[PDB]
């Protein structure tokens, strides 16, 4: 792999610790990184390290490299998982990122329905607000995430919501992102119809996904289109089906979901608008 000195971190300053989880393209381990935070240059920082599994494919390696490169481009923001460094030379590829001790949002919510704590309604609105802020920022950086979902949000020790899993994200210009393929690699239940049927993707497709994410949040980690298999959703979406209102959701926030699910992308809210609406709702709690 080519060197990128501004991101490279010395392997001898990294100490791997316990596994945090694994997927079908990589694994993540906790680690201590001495000197990685130049605001505290003497200190060890607890980080997460993404790396290949022993059964990794060639495509897994190219994907991990591509994920690292995307994270170099998306800037820095409180409500996204930020890249901290990488070990790319003379050894296995290590992609070093911010550590979120409370795991992904889907499990965090399902575990707070013995529960860890109780989610107040204010907590859920705040969580929604933070993620709209993250997506607003990503869209300002001309990034479409394409895989927004509760499983791809991470939660820090201080309950900070961080958008993560940039492996499918793309940088676009002004017009729709378009590449025609045989079959897509995006979770169908979170995809905007124009993405599913027309292979086109804009920031407004991410807005659709955000509406699904809202539904996951206010169902405390429920599964979208409950009891509807992916196989049958193609037809139901084309015919205009939409999810019902979660129990713990206000009619105001449900109207917000349904706006995100507008059939016409240009008629959905923008993330800037969602942040403004969510700012108002959250201050009134
Ligand atoms: N920065 C992190 N801090 C703490 N835990 C993490 C971090 N990143 C990932 N994990 C966890 O370790 C596991 C690794 O999975 P991950 O690398 O996130 O891909 P994925 O989200 O499982 N696949 P997908 O949702 O289909 O895109 C997940 O269970 C995460 O919850």
Numbering used by the authors: 468 to 580, 593 to 764
Sentences from the paper on this structure:
Lastly, the D650V mutation, which is not an authentic pathogenic FGFR mutation, corresponds to D816V, D842V and D835V mutations of KIT, PDGFR and FLT3, respectively, that frequently occurs in human Systemic mastocytosis, gasterointestinal stromal (GIST) tumors, and acute myeloid leukemia. To provide direct structural evidence for the participation of the αC tether in the allosteric communication network within FGFRK, we determined the crystal structure of the D650V FGFR2K mutant. According to our model, the D650V mutation should drive the kinase toward the active conformation by fortifying the hydrophobic contacts at the αC tether. Consistent with our prediction, D650V crystallized in a fully activated conformation displaying a disengaged molecular brake and an activated A-loop conformation. Additional structural analysis showed that the mutated V650 residue makes strong hydrophobic contacts with M537 and M540 between the αC helix and the A-loop thereby facilitating the rotation of the αC helix toward the C-lobe. As expected, the DFG latch is rearranged in a non-inhibitory conformation to facilitate N-lobe rotation, which in turn leads to the disengagement of the molecular brake. The D650V gain-of-function mutation strengthens the αC tether thereby stabilizing the kinase active conformation. (B) Close-up view of the DFG latch region showing that the DFG phenylalanine in the D650V mutant adopts the same rotamer position as the corresponding phenylalanine in the A-loop tyrosine phosphorylated WT FGFR2K. Relative to the unphosphorylated WT FGFR2K, the D650A, D650L, D650V, D650I, and M537I mutants were 3- to 19-fold more active, whereas the D650G, M537A, and M540A mutants were less active. Notably, the D650V mutation induced a perturbation at A567, which is in the vicinity of the molecular brake, whereas the M537I mutation did not significantly perturb this residue.
